Enzyme design. Structure first.
Site, short mmCIF file in Angstrom:
data_model
loop_
_atom_site.label_atom_id
_atom_site.label_comp_id
_atom_site.label_asym_id
_atom_site.label_seq_id
_atom_site.Cartn_x
_atom_site.Cartn_y
_atom_site.Cartn_z
N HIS A 19 0.83 -1.14 0.00
CA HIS A 19 0.00 0.00 0.00
C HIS A 19 0.89 1.22 0.00
O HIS A 19 0.39 2.33 0.09
CB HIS A 19 -1.02 -0.03 1.14
CG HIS A 19 -2.32 0.63 0.78
ND1 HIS A 19 -3.34 0.82 1.69
CD2 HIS A 19 -2.75 1.14 -0.40
CE1 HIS A 19 -4.35 1.42 1.08
NE2 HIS A 19 -4.02 1.63 -0.19
N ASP A 58 -9.56 0.53 4.02
CA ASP A 58 -8.42 -0.28 4.50
C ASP A 58 -8.85 -0.71 5.90
O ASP A 58 -9.85 -0.22 6.39
CB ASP A 58 -7.21 0.68 4.59
CG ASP A 58 -5.87 -0.02 4.58
OD1 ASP A 58 -5.70 -1.03 5.31
OD2 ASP A 58 -4.96 0.48 3.87
N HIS A 80 -6.60 -0.53 8.32
CA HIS A 80 -5.67 0.23 9.09
C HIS A 80 -5.69 1.66 8.60
O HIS A 80 -6.13 1.96 7.48
CB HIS A 80 -4.30 -0.39 8.86
CG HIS A 80 -4.31 -1.89 8.87
ND1 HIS A 80 -3.91 -2.65 7.78
CD2 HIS A 80 -4.60 -2.78 9.85
CE1 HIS A 80 -3.95 -3.93 8.10
NE2 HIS A 80 -4.36 -4.04 9.35
N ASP A 105 -3.01 3.31 8.10
CA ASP A 105 -1.82 3.33 7.25
C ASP A 105 -1.24 4.78 7.27
O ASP A 105 -0.59 5.24 6.30
CB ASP A 105 -2.14 2.80 5.83
CG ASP A 105 -2.17 1.25 5.76
OD1 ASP A 105 -1.95 0.61 6.81
OD2 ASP A 105 -2.40 0.66 4.65
N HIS A 127 5.01 0.65 4.13
CA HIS A 127 3.67 0.37 3.64
C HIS A 127 2.56 0.80 4.58
O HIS A 127 1.40 0.77 4.20
CB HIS A 127 3.55 -1.08 3.16
CG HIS A 127 2.91 -1.99 4.14
ND1 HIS A 127 3.63 -2.80 4.98
CD2 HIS A 127 1.61 -2.27 4.38
CE1 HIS A 127 2.81 -3.55 5.69
NE2 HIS A 127 1.58 -3.25 5.35
N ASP A 166 -7.73 -1.31 -0.21
CA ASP A 166 -6.70 -2.16 0.35
C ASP A 166 -7.50 -3.43 0.55
O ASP A 166 -8.42 -3.52 1.36
CB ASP A 166 -6.25 -1.59 1.69
CG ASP A 166 -5.17 -2.42 2.36
OD1 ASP A 166 -5.23 -3.67 2.25
OD2 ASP A 166 -4.27 -1.82 3.01
N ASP A 185 -7.11 -5.79 2.25
CA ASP A 185 -7.05 -6.34 3.63
C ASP A 185 -8.19 -5.98 4.57
O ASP A 185 -8.34 -6.60 5.65
CB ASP A 185 -5.65 -6.10 4.28
CG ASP A 185 -5.42 -4.66 4.86
OD1 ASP A 185 -6.32 -3.80 4.95
OD2 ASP A 185 -4.26 -4.42 5.25
N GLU A 188 -2.47 -4.53 -2.16
CA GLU A 188 -2.24 -5.65 -1.23
C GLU A 188 -2.46 -7.15 -1.51
O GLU A 188 -2.14 -7.97 -0.65
CB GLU A 188 -2.83 -5.33 0.15
CG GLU A 188 -2.15 -4.16 0.91
CD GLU A 188 -0.69 -4.42 1.35
OE1 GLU A 188 -0.23 -5.59 1.39
OE2 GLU A 188 0.01 -3.42 1.67
MN MN Z 1 -4.27 -2.42 5.23
#
Ligand code: MN
Ligand code: MN
Ligand code: MN
Lengths: 303, 303, 303
Positions: B96, B119, B121, B123, B136, B227, B229, B272
């Protein structure tokens, strides 16, 4: 402000084993260790040692009354202590029969509390209407002023004083109720949100409403008995009685972050984790793991 | 109106491998092939070839700065092109960390854009507060006018001009935030909807609100960095950092059909996908497969 | 008031087998046995014996027309009976081609009914626009006054009178529609709630709305054709055509308890259970098991 962690390992409430290993499962998981790291102060009472009456032969259609009753009394006076000394009790069980001890214990000191019962079952069957002698499904029956002497006095539950009425208890996540229990809850007036209610309004409102019901009149201590069986089995499969289509891991947490957020949780129970009903470790690693964030969520952990 | 598909394969942002194979994974899946069949016109830039600086020895607590920075700059000026030539860029990453290139690139031409960051997170960790040197998880940190010179200038990120402020970025799906990041996002005023918000209102409102926030004042180009994730690992298990209890496959799509529906998506990132963190093909066939309908959903596909 | 249970086992609507074993799967599961225990009175017609025309060679791009058509006619006049004799028909299929028989059958006696079609597909492709000759995806096409002679008369479907218009049919759970079908449903004006709608409002409103649409003008008998394929495959994996991201076990039930609750369900179909497309028994034990509570939910079972 400080949490005492009691360990109340017990299987006697129902006919399967390993339930008394639930507390060690969560401690091995790093519960107390991961709890220390909150704004809270953690003491660890360890696991109680339950007195087992020799031949406490089943009373009517109810198995193990003398072993369970004695077993709660000890819990009761251990919880009434922690409370008295100004701390929040967390009981790692054990069958859901441990709620009788946990609440009588909590209610002696804080007698104005309410109980938000997150379970898949009402767990409210009188020694009369019980099908499965198993007391682990009669807790609420024993602790309700409104049902007093509505089932012949079980032997060893005499120390028990009808803690709480139908107006200070709410159920969330119900989806497997026995007729009789429905007869009680529906005819007793007990407020509740079963899976369908959750479906029609989503936990967001469910919660917004249990609070406008219970904490409406006055703010009072909250006792929350989380029965790990009312999450969806995909999450907590390692339980004794799993019904499908329950709350989700996201929903469970939303309950805990809200109750946390009120600032009145003075008592909590993480009942029912059975580390031997989980086909495979992963299933067990899954139950324990999700049991723990519910505990932590109630103590500060957000997302 | 036409989509250019860039391939920005890169692992350097974090310490695991195979992430640079993510783009080939989705092309093999038939992305571009399944994209051609929309009302849109698809060009395929192919995968960029990332310049790897010899010994770009870790700067302070941050690994690979010179290799990542050089690596973004190329991306930046490739994206600023596609944009200029009036097309919508789609960057198949890659860590990312590729968002730094992708947005600086998008923002040179369209400097009024907003970024809806789906996402798990934030980030958003400054080279200061970073625990895991891994860049990242510092993308947003680098692209925020409000955090300029709040972390010593990383070597090779000098070409980077603080693209975007805290008022033109929204996060959806957060559930794993580091304290520092919370310090930033909460103290910087960054609007967002973490899992709990989604739980209290459901994507329906979540979306209804990010739009009444971002596109409220004026309609402007939308850059969306998905993302992979932040979906639930049951869906996209083949990622480097999976947290549990995220969005669902249904929710992911609802995000994409709405952003699609606005008619302002001028930029998207499918970051990701790691085809080597998936125990078994099925798990991989599952991540790739769900990564792709999110792309297609953003380009017309409805249900 | 009394339920007749018809068994309409049939695979001819599509090219896979075992679908005709669906009814025995649910009876073995204890359907009729678990149905007897409701406030309702259960009769069991048993499984119809389908007449198989020798060489009813495929008509144009549509396979098995003479075998399916004959096969429905028998069903039709069996359902028009049960209805006439004042009972609620429950057809355990079988392909979803059995809806043509089931509805013509229901509509002869109750011609004012509406049809709430819970499927993942529109199942509305005219013998013209059909890609897959399979009639199991043309049911609605055959039973719609608004599409009459819009596809050359299929051989053996002449007994069929255009039962129902576009204004007395609603779809819930759609997520896999063929272009042509979209052309029809969208251009015909057919109301519906695909997965996205469900996402934006949640079944709570979805349902609140199909009722304010259909039962708005007048209360009328409700025919509900539940295609087991529109739940999420995690739940009913043992189907012939599973698309991902559908309704959930909780959602399915919420549909059934509401339709039950109206008091107008005069007809229901539990179509598509294929006990041979389930890799493993568990998968099958899962489909059958969830198929059954939807049936029971429509007949009184609450939570
Ligand atoms: Mn993430
Ligand atoms: Mn329970
Ligand atoms: Mn279908």
């Amino acid at each position: 402000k400080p949490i005492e962690i009691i360990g109340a390992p017990f299987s006697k409430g129902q006919p399967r084993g390993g339930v008394e290993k639930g507390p060690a499962a969560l401690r091995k998981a790093g519960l107390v260790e991961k709890l220390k790291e909150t704004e809270y102060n953690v003491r660890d009472h360890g696991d109680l040692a339950f007195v087992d009456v020799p031949n406490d032969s089943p009373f009517q259609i109810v198995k193990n009354p003398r072993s369970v009753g004695k077993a709660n009394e000890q819990l009761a006076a251990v919880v009434a202590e922690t409370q008295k000394n100004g701390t929040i009790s967390v009981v790692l069980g054990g069958d859901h029969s441990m709620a009788i001890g946990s609440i009588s214990g909590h209610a002696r000191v804080h007698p104005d509390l309410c109980v938000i019962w997150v379970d898949a079952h009402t767990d409210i069957n009188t020694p009369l209407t019980t099908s499965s002698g198993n007391l682990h499904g009669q807790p609420v029956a024993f602790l309700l002023k409104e049902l007093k002497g509505k089932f012949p006095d079980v032997p060893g539950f005499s120390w028990v004083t009808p803690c709480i009425s139908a107006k200070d208890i709410v159920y969330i996540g119900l989806r497997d109720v026995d007729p009789g229990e429905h007869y009680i809850i529906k005819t007793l007036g007990i407020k509740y949100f079963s899976m369908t209610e959750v479906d029609k309004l989503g936990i967001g409102k469910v919660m917004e409403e249990t609070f406008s019901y219970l904490l409406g009149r006055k703010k009072r201590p909250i006792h929350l008995s989380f029965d790990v069986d009312g999450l969806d089995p995909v999450f907590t499969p390692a339980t004794g009685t799993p019904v499908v289509g329950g709350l989700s891991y996201r929903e469970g947490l939303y309950i805990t972050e809200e109750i946390y957020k009120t600032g009145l949780l003075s008592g909590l129970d993480i009942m029912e984790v059975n580390p031997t009903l989980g086909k495979t470790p992963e299933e067990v690693t899954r139950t324990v793991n999700t049991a723990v964030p519910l505990t932590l969520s109630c103590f500060g952990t957000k997302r």
